[PDB]
Design an enzyme around this catalytic site. Structure first.
Site, PDB file in Angstrom:
ATOM      1  N   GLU A  80       0.839  -1.192   0.000  1.00  0.00           N
ATOM      2  CA  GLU A  80       0.000   0.000   0.000  1.00  0.00           C
ATOM      3  C   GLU A  80       0.876   1.244   0.000  1.00  0.00           C
ATOM      4  O   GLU A  80       2.014   1.205   0.457  1.00  0.00           O
ATOM      5  CB  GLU A  80      -0.928  -0.006   1.224  1.00  0.00           C
ATOM      6  N   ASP A 136      -3.611   5.876   6.814  1.00  0.00           N
ATOM      7  CA  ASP A 136      -4.087   7.060   7.522  1.00  0.00           C
ATOM      8  C   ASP A 136      -4.889   6.652   8.757  1.00  0.00           C
ATOM      9  O   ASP A 136      -4.335   6.513   9.848  1.00  0.00           O
ATOM     10  CB  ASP A 136      -4.933   7.940   6.595  1.00  0.00           C
TER      11      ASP A 136
HETATM   12  N1  3L6 Z   1      -8.112   2.735  -0.817  1.00  0.00           N
HETATM   13  C1  3L6 Z   1      -8.292   3.888  -0.321  1.00  0.00           C
HETATM   14  C2  3L6 Z   1      -8.489   5.243   0.266  1.00  0.00           C
HETATM   15  C3  3L6 Z   1      -7.299   6.061   0.537  1.00  0.00           C
HETATM   16  N2  3L6 Z   1      -6.957   6.405   1.885  1.00  0.00           N
HETATM   17  C4  3L6 Z   1      -5.713   7.190   1.847  1.00  0.00           C
HETATM   18  C5  3L6 Z   1      -6.032   8.615   1.459  1.00  0.00           C
HETATM   19  N3  3L6 Z   1      -5.031   9.505   2.010  1.00  0.00           N
HETATM   20  C6  3L6 Z   1      -4.887   9.777   3.352  1.00  0.00           C
HETATM   21  N4  3L6 Z   1      -3.849  10.654   3.474  1.00  0.00           N
HETATM   22  C7  3L6 Z   1      -3.335  10.938   2.194  1.00  0.00           C
HETATM   23  C8  3L6 Z   1      -2.303  11.736   1.679  1.00  0.00           C
HETATM   24  O1  3L6 Z   1      -1.493  12.506   2.519  1.00  0.00           O
HETATM   25  N5  3L6 Z   1      -2.116  11.745   0.353  1.00  0.00           N
HETATM   26  C9  3L6 Z   1      -2.886  11.005  -0.505  1.00  0.00           C
HETATM   27  N6  3L6 Z   1      -2.633  11.061  -1.904  1.00  0.00           N
HETATM   28  N7  3L6 Z   1      -3.864  10.247  -0.038  1.00  0.00           N
HETATM   29  C10 3L6 Z   1      -4.101  10.197   1.273  1.00  0.00           C
HETATM   30  C11 3L6 Z   1      -6.745   5.171   2.649  1.00  0.00           C
HETATM   31  C12 3L6 Z   1      -6.050   5.479   4.005  1.00  0.00           C
HETATM   32  P1  3L6 Z   1      -7.028   4.807   5.419  1.00  0.00           P
HETATM   33  O2  3L6 Z   1      -8.406   4.192   4.903  1.00  0.00           O
HETATM   34  O3  3L6 Z   1      -6.206   3.698   6.147  1.00  0.00           O
HETATM   35  O4  3L6 Z   1      -7.323   5.927   6.377  1.00  0.00           O
HETATM   36 MG    MG Z   2      -4.314   3.099  -0.370  1.00  0.00          MG
END
Ligand code: 3L6
Ligand code: MG
Ligand code: 3L6
Ligand code: 3L6
Ligand code: 3L6
Ligand code: MG
Ligand code: MG
Ligand code: MG
Lengths: 200, 201, 202, 196
Positions: free
Chosen positions: C118, C122
């Site tokens: 991955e 988050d």
């Molecule tokens: N597959 C999906 C959703 C994306 N999420 C990540 C979205 N995301 C969360 N933070 C960031 C970031 O800083 N940059 C980018 N490009 N994407 C970010 C998943 C993190 P989580 O469900 O464990 O909380």
């Molecule tokens: Mg992801």
């Protein structure tokens, strides 16, 4: 042991248009003989062979300038890559000769790996092996990127060969023609419109 | 115009002993057919060709999973290298698709589309995909395939960008597979008889 | 190992010090993680993975879209090990996003060493779900490799088995990580300028 | 551009976060500048060189031994620009060891691993000025902040580092640590083992 990657006499090589070529060399080269990446893939294997055979003691890597500098760097980079991802590891020191270099007293008792760009007649390496051995190294091995099939050969064969090539004047990958073509990434054959132009 | 690097029918390939080969495939391969480094060199020129022809508008790079993933990654890396080291550049966007269609996605409309495939054989896969893409009116569709096979079974499709034109021999490696195996191999190689039998389904 | 820790007050790098795509010139603020730093960390990560999962057949599972760069690079380093050692293990690959849309029947995960790749963790929700789902098909092992892990209050508390970098609660892009499908074509991990955040807003 | 500035309080990186050679496992304290970071800085350094010297024939002069790794990589990036631009300008390579080893009316690019006091670069500059070329620029990977400095500032700088003794990336300690990817700080055990 191995004669290296054998390139035949009838090998046509590759059209320059098929690759990204330093375009201040467009009309001077005939064909690409050995592409940069092919050298890399072969050098990776050579690196593993070197470590298998000399990785039981401290190694002194001896670069033969100028033509051997590119091969030397990439060869060492692949060796260093092995040494930081394996449990087996030997320290390496580096030296540069052309003339110059450190006192060959530093070669005594050590494993010496000589790195050369090409073996033609074999005279240069015989002379070099003669001079090195008079300082009694623990071991002397020679790795050459190229070995040329030529009637003028003494019959010397290095310990590690990248490529065995026909009797044609190759340039590139630090190999020159009167100091030209060193900045070329591939090993290519110099033409007549390139020979007469850069002659003398 | 360019048919790509032409590999002759009598191409012997390389002895395995000359290269670094994964141990679990030692007896499963016959020859190294297209060395990894050669693929990179050819791909570098291909990136320049793509930038010459499509570097005018926003492009969408479409990866044809699974076999195209390696070629997709490297080709994009080479394009990105151009974008960050040149005066004018083109922003890219990436999509993914797997064909029987399992992937997505209608986002291709009005965009410069670059489809990236591992190998054209009969041409059916690409014909099908091109029909599905043209369904949604993109500004431009282009196809880059690492390999194009010479075969009488060919419907007659030729992509806009070709790395290598090869004989009708079954190749693996560089993400290309044989029953899901050999994807974990950098070189494009030919399977041995034992290899075919071992991983036969 | 929490991976390379990045402090909350890390200034990052001035864009002028690195080579960046000119079409993102006024859209980024600072370089957070240089692409080369990512590769080095990834090299060590590959060794750790093989040290722990090299026992049996590995199924590498890439989480599209954001994880493709990390996946390709991680697997490249793993392959480098496999062709330079005496012991190597076969590896098959699969692609999923992001319910599980696309990909092979997860029954093929039964009995194998599954490695999930991955881009970023988050809240940890995306991964905890996928883990619980994958665990249903009874594989010998499931491990998660994630390039980034955020220190966020919203965090459920999931910790992956392999971590590249631990980062502050800022929104980063690059190395296949997107802001509305943009910035995936960026080599470095960076922070978005407000001008860029407004230009590519959805 | 004063290059990338590494502060004095730079903790560097823990060795366990990276792949390091076995024979140096206890000889190193911290990874100071990751190899990949060096490549990224070098890439941008190449476009700076081409911006300034890329209108004419360049002679890149490698300063052995410490500068060989930086020289090779910097050249690869310049060569990469050179075969992707439209105005491909040729370049020749020369080597000098400082004077063991070793142009007139040519563009000279001097490539060095580290500027400390400036004594090495001073001598080389005056030794190159004698041959009377067109332009001479100096590219140095590292510029060390030090009270022992003459005050020389080269034309191209990768990193500005505190007054610590770093090794790796062809930079040595009694000829050791050249076979190392990252620029790192020596451990006290390492200083003792490889002392001359
Ligand atoms: N597959 C999906 C959703 C994306 N999420 C990540 C979205 N995301 C969360 N933070 C960031 C970031 O800083 N940059 C980018 N490009 N994407 C970010 C998943 C993190 P989580 O469900 O464990 O909380
Ligand atoms: Mg992801
Ligand atoms: N006196 C010599 C310089 C190097 N020689 C190599 C010159 N040389 C001989 N053949 C070639 C060639 O094809 N390309 C290039 N660049 N150089 C070539 C030594 C070869 P050897 O006959 O002593 O074993
Ligand atoms: N339905 C499927 C995709 C795969 N096919 C490619 C299968 N294929 C055809 N030849 C090869 C080969 O040599 N190696 C591998 N791994 N696969 C091969 C498409 C080629 P086309 O006949 O639709 O133009
Ligand atoms: N030609 C050689 C080496 C001498 N100096 C390099 C010695 N040196 C000065 N600082 C360092 C260091 O941090 N690491 C290593 N390996 N060497 C260092 C050059 C800088 P200057 O003091 O002449 O201006
Ligand atoms: Mg020579
Ligand atoms: Mg396909
Ligand atoms: Mg120096």
């Amino acid at each position: 042991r191995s004669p290296g990657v054998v390139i035949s006499d009838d090998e046509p090589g590759y059209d320059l248009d098929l690759f990204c070529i330093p375009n201040h060399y467009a009309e001077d080269l005939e064909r690409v003989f050995i592409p940069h990446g092919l050298i890399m893939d072969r050098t990776e294997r050579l690196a593993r062979d070197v470590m298998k055979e000399m990785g039981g003691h401290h190694i002194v890597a001896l670069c033969v300038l100028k033509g051997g500098y590119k091969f030397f760097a990439d060869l060492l980079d692949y060796i260093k890559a092995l040494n930081r991802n394996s449990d087996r590891s030997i320290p390496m020191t580096v030296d540069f000769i052309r003339i110059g270099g450190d006192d060959l007293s530093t070669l005594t008792g050590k494993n010496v790996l000589i790195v050369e760009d090409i073996i033609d007649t074999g005279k240069t390496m015989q002379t070099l092996l003669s001079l090195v051995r008079q300082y009694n190294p623990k071991m002397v091995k020679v790795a050459s990127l190229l070995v040329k099939r030529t009637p003028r050969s003494v019959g010397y064969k290095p310990d590690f060969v990248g490529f065995e090539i026909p009797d044609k004047f190759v340039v590139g990958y630090a190999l020159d023609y009167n100091e030209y073509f060193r900045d070329l990434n591939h090993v290519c054959v110099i033409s007549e419109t390139g020979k007469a132009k850069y002659k003398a």
